[PDB]
């Protein structure tokens, strides 16, 4: 085998021919089985991209003092929806920030050209439970997307620490300092047994190497403050990464989803702030073809200088 128990070649595509409507047992693996086992824990709504701006404390009006992190949402927009009939899973693609057109490549310039959205800085997907979590393309998500007291999960890239030793990377105790130790004060020590243990270093051995700059999730962080003007969403506790780093905020998976009334109110607010998200999208998709057909012919210069 190469991966798991499957000896099937890698270019074979037999999934459509083994159907459950033909009387076959539902497979235990595959996208369908994966989504059922994660149905309870998948969020109902999408998430937002925020930038870690710093740390502070929230002072209550009766004596409370709560450490918290300030996460700012900068021009967060919905860029695309991932359906189960086209991709195999439900998800919403969200954007953050802005970027100069010259830095954006032609493949991505046309990707936004067919949506009516300015080129974004980053993009990320947020898995949703079902089709009810898909949002219109081109709608901005504000801090009010969450409500005070709501628990969320913050995913971010930890602070890089370069090549770390055994003490910092794996909590090795080290060795003695003065009782005769020769050149072995912070070293890892022995790396395994002798002939009876394989005559080799065993896979999975904890050794020095690079540490940090990996994704880390913090679960169950309440929302202390929500300010739309400032664009910040204050959450209790710490968050992975450095200031100015992009993090992913979404409802907690180990907690009950937000009330039904809230999930509808937030969706009903996107229809008011942007009464026409489809009319502007269909017009953009109609312009992409006109420009895409001009690039093929080579008459794009005429359209640019038309008016």
């Amino acid at each position: 085998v190469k991966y798991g128990w499957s000896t099937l070649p890698k270019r074979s595509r037999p999934t459509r021919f083994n159907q459950v409507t033909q009387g076959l047992p539902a497979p235990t693996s595959g996208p369908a089985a994966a989504l059922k086992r994660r149905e309870k824990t998948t969020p109902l709504r999408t998430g937002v991209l925020a930038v870690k701006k710093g740390m502070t404390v929230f002072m209550g009006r009766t004596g409370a003092r709560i450490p918290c992190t300030v996460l700012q949402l900068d021009r967060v927009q919905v860029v695309a929806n991932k359906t189960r009939a086209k991709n195999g899973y439900w998800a919403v693609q969200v954007g953050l920030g802005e970027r100069r057109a010259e830095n954006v490549g032609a493949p991505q310039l046309g990707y936004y050209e067919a949506k009516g959205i300015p080129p974004k800085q980053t993009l990320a997907e947020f898995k949703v439970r079902n089709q009810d979590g898909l949002l219109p393309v081109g709608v901005q998500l504000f801090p009010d997307w969450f409500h005070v007291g709501q628990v969320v999960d913050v995913r971010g890239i930890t602070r890089g620490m370069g090549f770390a030793g055994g003490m910092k990377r794996h909590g090795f105790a080290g060795q003695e300092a003065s009782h005769g130790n020769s050149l072995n004060h912070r070293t890892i020590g022995s790396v395994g047994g002798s002939q009876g243990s394989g005559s080799r270093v065993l896979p999975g051995k904890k050794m020095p190497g690079r540490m940090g700059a990996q994704q880390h999730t913090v679960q169950n962080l309440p929302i202390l403050m929500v300010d739309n003007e400032l664009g910040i969403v204050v959450v209790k506790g710490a968050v992975a990464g450095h200031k100015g780093a992009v993090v992913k905020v979404q409802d907690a998976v180990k907690k009950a989803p937000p009330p039904e009334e809230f999930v509808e109110a937030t969706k009903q607010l996107l229809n008011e702030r942007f009464p026409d998200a489809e009319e502007k999208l269909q017009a953009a998709r109609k312009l992409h073809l006109e420009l895409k057909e001009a690039r093929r012919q080579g008459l794009i210069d005429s359209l640019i200088k038309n008016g």
Binding site: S6, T7, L8, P14, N18, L24, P27, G198, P203
Partner: protein
């Protein structure tokens, strides 16, 4: 040397054979009486017949070095026949070289994830020569769970009748009779 001087094209061509794991097989069954008791070919007795086709050993031009094998489409692998209590008592083991990481799974639990086609690929794989042609030969075994497959047009035919169909034998005898009308 005359016997092998000629067109070898069609002797090395890949034929797409077909077999159903549910259809009773009077030859590959151990119960040969009565007619109603004839069972399908067991896992290992079907795999031994398939490994012979993948090697091209059924041909009179077989050579272990040359890859003169054929394709085999096995359908209805969900109803793969097994005797005794193999389905729930046979274990498949796997190791990645790391002590502690031994993965075991029963035949019935392996048929819930990758269906019965994976259980058949493991049997045929172990019956093939352990060399640099084992993965090419095993790749020509296209096993499916039901009756649907993308090779319903590739299966070898004789007069429009797929081999193994109701009237394929009569269609073959009719073409050889016309062949005799020549010097």
């Amino acid at each position: 040397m005359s016997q092998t001087v000629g067109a070898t094209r069609l002797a090395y061509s890949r034929v797409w054979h077909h077999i159903s794991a549910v259809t009773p097989h009077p030859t590959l069954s151990t119960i040969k009486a009565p007619s109603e008791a004839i069972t399908p070919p067991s896992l290992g007795r079907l795999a031994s017949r398939i490994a012979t086709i993948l090697m091209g050993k059924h041909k009179p031009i077989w050579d272990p070095s040359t890859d003169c094998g054929d394709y085999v489409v096995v359908t209805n692998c969900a109803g793969l026949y097994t005797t005794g209590h193999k389905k729930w008592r046979k274990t498949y083991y796997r190791h990645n070289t790391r002590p502690g990481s031994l993965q075991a799974i029963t035949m019935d639990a392996l048929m819930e994830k990758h269906g019965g086609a994976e259980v058949l690929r493991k049997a045929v794989s172990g019956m093939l020569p352990k060399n640099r042609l084992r993965d090419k030969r095993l790749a020509r075994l296209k096993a499916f769970e039901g009756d649907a497959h993308p090779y319903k047009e590739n299966l070898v035919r004789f007069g429009g009748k797929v081999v193994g169909a109701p009237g394929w034998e009569e269609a073959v005898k009719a073409i050889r009779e016309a062949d005799m009308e020549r010097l």
